[PDB]
């Protein structure tokens with residue numbers, strides 16, 4: 154995996170030696186070349202994983218998250234260059250360096266063969282995200298949101314360090330390839346119960362779980378646009394990736410420890426969607442929608458059936474693209490009205506028709522419109538949870554009702570109605586912004602054509 | 613532990629040298645010259661056995677030789693010896709330097725009648741050699757069996773198998 158790590162690090166001399174007007178063009182160009190090269194991770198087999206070295210490997214789960222991670226960096230560079238136009242050049246290069254460094258940490262977080270190196274990279278991804286939020290965030294509450302984002306993740310993950318080093322002492326190795334074959338069944342005890350909690354609660358925070366999600370409508374809102382994109386698209390998916398790696402070691406104790414978290418997530422996908430029905434902040438509406446979608450990924454991981462993992466990884470990739478595009482659309486309003494209040498700017502389809510078409514497509518993919526991979530993930534998780542318990546179809550269908558309701562309420566409020574009279578700075582849509590929306594949506598619509606590359610290790 | 617094994621009171625009875633310290637100091641150099649051999653057998657037995665219970669016969673030979681020494685003084689040269697140890701006995705620190713004429717009288721009469729020569733400066737402090745017939749003590753400290761040491765290292769130092777083996781560091 155060194156063939157992606159080395160160009161990602163060579164982005165740093167590429168961004169610290171570029172001209173004062175060239176530091177966006179060159180970084181976008183070469184990160185798009187890295188994203189083109191990221192397709193070579195699709196050499197996957199139906200029995201064996203693509204195993205590179207002692208340090209790095211990539212199965213069919215890590216591969217779509219890797220292509221998504223190496224694709225999201227040019228989109229963050231396009232999104233975050235307008236509000237940093239007035240910025241100092243050195244701080245501009247520092248922002249690009251934090252983005253490049255976060256990509257570097259993520260692409261060797263997903264490919265980490267051994268679990269403590271996964272942990273080191275997984276907690277290494279805090280500090281560029283923390284610096285981006287707390288330094289280039291816009292408002293006063295970026296500092297408190299940085300505190301919440303830091304100290305929920307560390308409070309979840311420092312028990313995970315102790316649990317992983319205990320696995321290193323008991324099994325002899327934290328290699329995932331070794332732990333596929335030396336995995337001992339974990340019986341019922343209190344010690345194995347808190348073993349399970351220390352293994353799971355870090356990723357429960359990072360998904361987020363309902364009740365542990367209070368960091369998210371502050372971190373995803375008070376961030377700048379590139380920070381909100383990477384938080385919505387990759388850093389919620391580190392939790393699902395870590396759960397799918399760590400729940401091998403947690404059988405059969407998962408089959409009764411999963412119940413309180415399954416209740417929390419099945420009820421929180423209703424509660425956060427109802428919250429989205431009464432949000433005045435658009436960026437907070439997209440944040441609580443992200444919690445509402447990742448609750449299904451938590452349930453799909455904890456019921457641990459093959460259909461559930463296929464739906465969970467499709468839902469992760471699809472929600473990454475969709476929620477990143479929704480945050481970029483909210484930025485496209487915020488760069489014109491300078492407020493995140495959803496009831497401020499209305500009637501924008503009269504003024505920005507192509508942008509309203511992008512809003513329409515993103516709101517359709519948010520409410521899981523078939524045959525998108527949003528609906529493929531949503532539907533497969535619904536099938537597997539109906540296999541889990543037949544009564545869960547009530548919660549799943551009521552979540553789908555409220556999800557369609559808040560998605561089209563967002564669409565009708567921002568884009569439809571009569572335009573607000575006292576706002577006269579609604580510029581036309583830039584080529585940069587429409588290109589950003591298209592580079593989100595067009596891969597998402599192309600993945601409906603060949604959806605088998607985003608369906609996990611057990612397609 | 614074990615019962616300590618003491619000699620009887622009859623094993624300790626010997627005819628004592630019941631003279632004063634100035635009497636012993638007056639004829640000290642002739643005592644070192646003439647009573648050399650049983651005294652050195654005793655002090656070698658005393659520094660080798662490291663036990664006074666293993667030295668009782670040698671101490672009795674010391675006491676017998678000292679008694680014969682003072683009886684051989686008393687028969688021939690009793691009055692210059694009494695004149696000499698009285699003058700030694702007068703002083704508090706009992707100096708030899710204060711009594712050189714009584715010393716000359718005593719040494720003269722002793723050399724003339726008993727043939728004893730007073731040793732020179734340096735002679736009584738010599739480390740001598742002692743011909744004993746008793747065997748050498750094989751374990752005077754009664755030291756038990758020593759603990760066997762830990763095994764030493766041996767063999768050529770091969771490299772570490774797959775490096776440090778520290779979680780993922782392949783070197």
Ligand SMILES: CCCCCCCCCCCCCCCCCC(=O)OC[C@H](COP(=O)([O-])OC[C@H](O)COP(=O)([O-])OC[C@H](COC(=O)CCCCCCCCCCCCCCCCC)OC(=O)CCCCCCCCCCCCCCCCC)OC(=O)CCCCCCCCCCCCCCCCC
Pocket residue numbers: 506507509510511513514517518522523524525526595598599601602
């Ligand atoms: C690998 C090769 C693949 C080749 C085939 C391509 C496959 C599909 C690719 C994506 C297709 C959509 C692209 C256009 C929409 C986005 C841009 C836009 O809005 O432009 C408006 C504009 C036309 O409007 P305008 O008059 O100029 O101005 C806009 C108006 O002011 C105001 O605009 P508006 O709102 O009035 O009009 C927008 C209208 C609004 O209409 C809607 O929103 C209604 C759509 C939903 C209901 C109807 C469809 C339901 C599902 C049935 C169809 C799918 C299954 C069919 C199969 C059989 C049955 C199973 O939407 C459309 O007209 C889009 C038609 C296609 C819709 C596809 C589904 C989108 C819905 C959301 C996701 C649904 C699930 C995923 C489906 C994925 C299918 C592949 O279009 C363009 O200028 C198009 C430019 C070129 C687009 C290229 C797209 C492909 C790019 C990929 C590049 C790499 C691969 C190479 C292939 C290249 C092919 C050329």
Ligand SMILES: CCCCCCCCCCCCCCCCCC(=O)OC[C@H](COP(=O)([O-])OC[C@H](O)COP(=O)([O-])OC[C@H](COC(=O)CCCCCCCCCCCCCCCCC)OC(=O)CCCCCCCCCCCCCCCCC)OC(=O)CCCCCCCCCCCCCCCCC
Pocket residue numbers: 154155158159162163165166206207208209257273780781782783
């Ligand atoms: C006949 C005489 C002539 C013979 C000539 C032969 C050589 C020809 C080429 C000449 C150049 C040689 C260069 C070194 C050999 C290759 C080393 C290598 O790639 O190891 C793969 C190594 C393990 O992967 P592998 O596939 O198992 O091993 C492949 C080989 O067998 C690797 O071999 P190995 O198995 O023997 O490796 C042993 C072990 C293998 O590794 C392990 O066992 C895993 C543990 C490694 C450390 C993990 C620490 C994690 C926590 C801290 C993270 C820090 C932040 C990350 C970076 C942030 C940005 C600076 O290495 C270490 O543990 C060393 C520590 C890491 C340093 C790697 C060497 C760097 C040299 C250049 C420094 C330039 C700055 C680089 C960035 C600084 C951070 C690396 O990859 C990593 O650890 C990933 C991190 C990046 C490595 C650096 C890549 C080297 C080239 C960088 C060029 C671009 C620089 C851009 C500017 C500066 C940054 C902005």
Ligand SMILES: CCCCCCCCCCCCCCCCCC(=O)OC[C@H](COP(=O)([O-])OCC[N+](C)(C)C)OC(=O)CCCCCCCCCCCCCCCCC
Pocket residue numbers: 305308309312315316319344345347348350351354355358
């Ligand atoms: C995000 C905030 C909330 C975080 C919650 C994190 C999970 C909650 C539970 C964590 C427990 C602590 C780590 C356990 C690691 C288990 C590893 C192991 O070997 O276990 C078996 C071992 C068993 O011991 P052993 O393995 O040495 O024994 C040999 C094996 N037997 C048992 C067969 C003889 O368990 C323990 O030793 C104790 C486990 C419980 C520890 C209790 C103290 C911590 C209490 C919870 C703190 C929660 C966070 C507080 C901060 C919140 C925010 C401010």
